[PDB]
Symmetry: C6
Amino acid sequence: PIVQNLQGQMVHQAISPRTLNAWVKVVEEKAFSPEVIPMFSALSEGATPQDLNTMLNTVGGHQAAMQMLKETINEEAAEWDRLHPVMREPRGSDIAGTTSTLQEQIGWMTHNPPIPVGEIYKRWIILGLNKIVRMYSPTSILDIRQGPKEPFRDYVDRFYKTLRAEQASQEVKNWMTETLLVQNANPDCKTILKALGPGATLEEMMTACQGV
Amino acid sequence: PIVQNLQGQMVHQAISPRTLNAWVKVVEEKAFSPEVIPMFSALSEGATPQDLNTMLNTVGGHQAAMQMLKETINEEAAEWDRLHPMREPRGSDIAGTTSTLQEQIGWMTHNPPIPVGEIYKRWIILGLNKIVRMYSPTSILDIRQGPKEPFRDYVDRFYKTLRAEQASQEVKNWMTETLLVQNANPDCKTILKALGPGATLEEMMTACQGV
Amino acid sequence: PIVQNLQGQMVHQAISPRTLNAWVKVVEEKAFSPEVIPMFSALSEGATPQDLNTMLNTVGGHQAAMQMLKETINEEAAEWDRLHPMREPRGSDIAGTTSTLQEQIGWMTHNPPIPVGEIYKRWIILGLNKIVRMYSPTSILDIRQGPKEPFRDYVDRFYKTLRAEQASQEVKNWMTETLLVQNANPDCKTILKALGPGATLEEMMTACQGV
Amino acid sequence: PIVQNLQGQMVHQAISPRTLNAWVKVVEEKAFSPEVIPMFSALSEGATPQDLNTMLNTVGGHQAAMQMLKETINEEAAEWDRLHPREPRGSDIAGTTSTLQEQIGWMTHNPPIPVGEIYKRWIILGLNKIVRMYSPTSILDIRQGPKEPFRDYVDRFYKTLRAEQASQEVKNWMTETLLVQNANPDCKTILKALGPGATLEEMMTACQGV
Amino acid sequence: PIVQNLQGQMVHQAISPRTLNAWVKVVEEKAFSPEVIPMFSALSEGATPQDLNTMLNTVGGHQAAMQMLKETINEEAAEWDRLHPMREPRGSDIAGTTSTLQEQIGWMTHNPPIPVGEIYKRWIILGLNKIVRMYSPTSILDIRQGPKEPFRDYVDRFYKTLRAEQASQEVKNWMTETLLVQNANPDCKTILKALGPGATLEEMMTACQGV
Amino acid sequence: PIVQNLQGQMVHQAISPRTLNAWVKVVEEKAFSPEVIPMFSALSEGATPQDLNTMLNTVGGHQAAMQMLKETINEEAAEWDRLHPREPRGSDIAGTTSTLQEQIGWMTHNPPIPVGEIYKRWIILGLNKIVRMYSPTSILDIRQGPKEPFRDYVDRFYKTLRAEQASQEVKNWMTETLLVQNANPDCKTILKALGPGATLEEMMTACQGV
């Protein structure tokens, strides 16, 4: 993070050991289930690129994913260097915290109009984690279907946990929640859902399918 | 939360990692048992809408409940826009989706403030109440005392179910007066009906010690 | 709790997540063993009625006890409205149910203060007392020394029961004097009669090390 | 503990939940091993009598000891009321008849009237009696087994000697005399090949692996 | 670390006991898996040479590694004395063995600073790199896919080995492009050949979903 | 430790309960492995003699070692009382005959008399002697098993070498000569094929997978 000292100057605050152990436990145990993007954003709230790189590099397992993340970050950094051609201006490799010192990072993050390289880099990281969370999704939302003896609450849990991993826009996710959840239900249960009419809330749908 | 910085400005304090681990543990272990509403309300005591959204979005399980929560928030956000035609916060601003963190801190620190973190925490608690009612594992009419079950343990099950049911107080009065007696063992029920109608819960449990 | 902000303003401080995790663990592990009341009074030392309600409402188990507690708080609040016909707090205001947190701060920081957090913590401790003396597993008259049981272990059981026992200190004095001897083994009871009627517990246990 | 607010007024700081859980775990697990008194003196360092009473009242188990502790606190409080005929009474120092505001008033007076320190002395005087009673056997009964390592016998001897009540001159006599005389006949022979007053380092070196 | 006191003097603050317990657990659980380098560098962001020596010397296990580390540090310190013939630090001063920590505070806060903590943390990381390479459980050429092993798990094992593999990025490029293909199962290798040579890792893993 | 209050006065900060639990765990679990001395030094970097006495006295086990520790502290304190004829006596540096306010006084005079550092040196001298005694065998006895990995033998060799009292010239001779000569005969054939100047990195590179 960044803090201002008693001397009246901006300075680093090292990312806490408990925060790193929390992040590593999150990544290792939850294996890029979609709640990893919000835990990353929450744990990383003040992070400099030094802190962000510390969070990524301290992950031990999932090195396939951490490579796909690194390859995404490099793709975003290359796109940055295209969109932003040539306190110095940061290259993409500077925002990724690779060719920049921590004092350059704090210099940008506290400039008069700040260049928020920690936020910009945290975007590129979340863009990479999104692709990983999609890749670790057990199936596509069009394939999530209710088993012949599966409770509707458990199918709804599977549906909405898969929908979090979809790269659909919210307009398409809206259509999915409205249409696929009924379309993919178990035919007895599906008959109950259609008997509510198509506009039913999820509370009404799950109320109707209690123990069905 | 919001904190006065050393520059004197009102500034965001990030919701603690230990607070998020506590919250996510609470939700995923206790699975919308009714004590989740007061733990939520405690852990979020200072929360901006960004912090509240962080607490909700960091839950991994129970995505049926978390969607029912989001649909409740959208319903309350619409009712807010019906009630309510710096900038005026509208429903998606209270919910922290269309409002920036500095708009949220703006409203929460104006004079008089618009306490968008409190307003949103109300809409969340409304959604969590609906979930806690839906996740009640069996109805109160199904809570019965087993033939060798201590009355104290049956009462624990009965009142734990009454928390989850969200019934109105006259109906809880009727249930605690009549079902708590009538679902007891035949002998324990014989004791409890001998106490007459006015028995306090202390008196009912006192009478059934060691039955 | 209540704290003074850097602007010199009296303001509420959220009851810490570690304090609530500690309290909820204390209640649900120790099951109203008498040390739950000292832990409650420790963990709630500056608590507002909102903080006290947060501590009670976050308990998930023991909903029989938590109902007897609520039932007691309502009885003490009704007695407060009999005793007591800025706005003056009624019993439901002390209990934090009809009062806002800013009212609670106002009462707790007025001059002279109306210490509604301390008053309400009295009513909670009265309810926990009534619960502790019901979760007590047996009467002090039932605590006896087993034929091969060390006197130190019997004394541990006697005084742990005597904490949960309802009795006033004059009666506790008589119990420590008379029952502690009379319920011992005939061997220990012989040694302890040889000490005469007046012996400290240090002397009694000193005499019964090798018996 | 005691802290000064940003208003400059002296105020209470609540004894931390981790400090109470540490203390209660110490008393419950370690069962008045002598190390309990240094842990008490460490955990209670800034404690007002209300903090000290919280530490004692939360212990839960060992209610024989905790009753002996309050009985000897009352012994000390009665002696205080004899030796010192508003000034605190013994019941005020014990935190029973005094409010937290009175306790802080005394502890921050000029000169400070340190009722938390005075009461912590009475508590440690009571825990001494308890540790001396929960001691499993007399120092004179600690003897070395036929194949027991001298290092483990010394561990047992000095752990017993911590709980032993005697003065340091007596403990000097005990460490000189009994540790040798109660040693295994092999070790006892080695310790007679050493000088009569060898250091414990020398004694343990000479008997290492004997 | 170094922190300025409220009296304005620059002074050392020791690494937290929690930071040490974290480091010692990291080393002794993770046993020079490559994530030890970034945990070391994270837990020592502001460390003086005395802080760094405190981290190294508190490791109990792996005294083979800790000796290889020590004699690497001595090689870098000897090279520093070759490159560099208040007082100017020798290599043994930067290693924190011959210098006082007051000299370390001096050098690290001089203008311009002589950043002996950062220099020494480089020598430590160069030694830990050699140890992570040494403790690597097998060669990258020996990582192959089991007959029913998911490609995702094989790629995890491959890139986890490729972190400890010291080879330059030109050779990592060749290995990721051609060994990862050729060390796969015959079915999975057939899928990866059908992509042609230019596939990114995301494409390779996309293709081998459910192979 | 020593801290300055919000009033700017010099103030004791109590040694943290979590730090004491960490130290107590270190001593009970790791039983004077040589890394106990670095852990001790790290957990006590700001300690007054009262904090240091709290760290020692809260140890439960190993009362043989803790007696050796306190009686070598008495030896160092006696040597200080000879070598330095208020000025603190050795018993004051050891925190026995001095108050906490005297200890802070000496630690904050100009120039300071850093009694917490001087005493921490005497404690480390005693932990040195204890670590050298609790070492389960001498380095001459460390040998490689018939099928033991050279990396595990090296781990055992250097973990033993940490606990040796040997000077660095002797440790250089030992690491050069014994580590080779006590290696398994096939593994020793590899190491001999490296020639005399091999680094430990080279020796392990050669014997990895022997």
